[PDB]
Amino acid sequence: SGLCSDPAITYLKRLGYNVVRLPREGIQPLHLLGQQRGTVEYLGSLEKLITQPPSEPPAITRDQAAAGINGQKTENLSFSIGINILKSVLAQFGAGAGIEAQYNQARKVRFEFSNVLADSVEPLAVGQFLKMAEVDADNPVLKQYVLGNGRLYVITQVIKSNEFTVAAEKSGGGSIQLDVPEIQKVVGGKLKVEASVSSQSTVTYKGEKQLVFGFKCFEIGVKNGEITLFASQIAMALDAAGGVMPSDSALLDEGGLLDLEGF
């Protein structure tokens, strides 16, 4: 935990998204998160709990444009903060190491979102699927979370992109000349590196994978005698709240960026 305040994070959390410290390809709707003693662990597929489905599963709608998130920018980040983000995002795209050496003149870097897509299930359909399941009485997820000391959440929506844009500045805001051919040689062929038509120092990195950088989830528990999906903040079942609002999804790291274990 800790405080990481940024306009881009604030916007995404207001939409209801957890924002992860480390964007990752493997984060999916209908996957489970286990929370115990602070730490959130990525558990994997909902079928670890629902070993025999009661019905067709909630359909996943894929690749919906998120035009409100597109164009969102972070603050102008001090190098120590911004370069660790750039390094780790490029690593997750499979880039070769060494991007920091190409940005050694940068005092500040700012990120811009583009090409953001959402994959989603309908939370109320997940809630129906959960409450109608016949879970085995000895199922390990049931016993450790639903009837145990952990807290379980199910992911209902992810936001992802295969690209991002970095603007860089020198001290005082001075323009910087970046060696784009060298940057390309550093990250390798799995990335396409291109400067902006209007700014030599603004560079877009495009990979071959979609990295999830935010997700919505809802807590699983027991109410009305059944396994229940809850609105966040009496504990209220999601299907009793009146629609599903941005504020109903659970934010697991309210102050900052969410760490995920299990990868």
Curated annotation (Swiss-Prot):
Species name: Vitiosangium sp. (strain GDMCC 1.1324)
Gene Ontology CC, one term: plasma membrane
Record keywords: Antiviral defense, Cell inner membrane, Cell membrane, Cytoplasm, Lipoprotein, Membrane, Palmitate, Transmembrane, Transmembrane beta strand
TM region(s), chain numbering: 69-85, 97-114, 163-180, 189-205
Membership in a protein family: Belongs to the bacterial gasdermin family.
Name this protein carries in UniProt: Gasdermin bGSDM
Organism lineage: Bacteria, Pseudomonadati, Myxococcota, Myxococcia, Myxococcales
Keyword Acyltransferase: no
GO biological process: defense response to virus
Maturation and modification: Palmitoylation helps stabilize the inactive state; may self palmitoylate. Palmitoylation plays a significant role in pore formation.
Lipidation (S-palmitoyl cysteine): 4
Comment on protein domains: The N-terminus has marked structural similarity to the mammalian gasdermin N-terminal domain. The C-terminal region wraps around the twisted beta sheet core, probably stabilizing the inactive state.
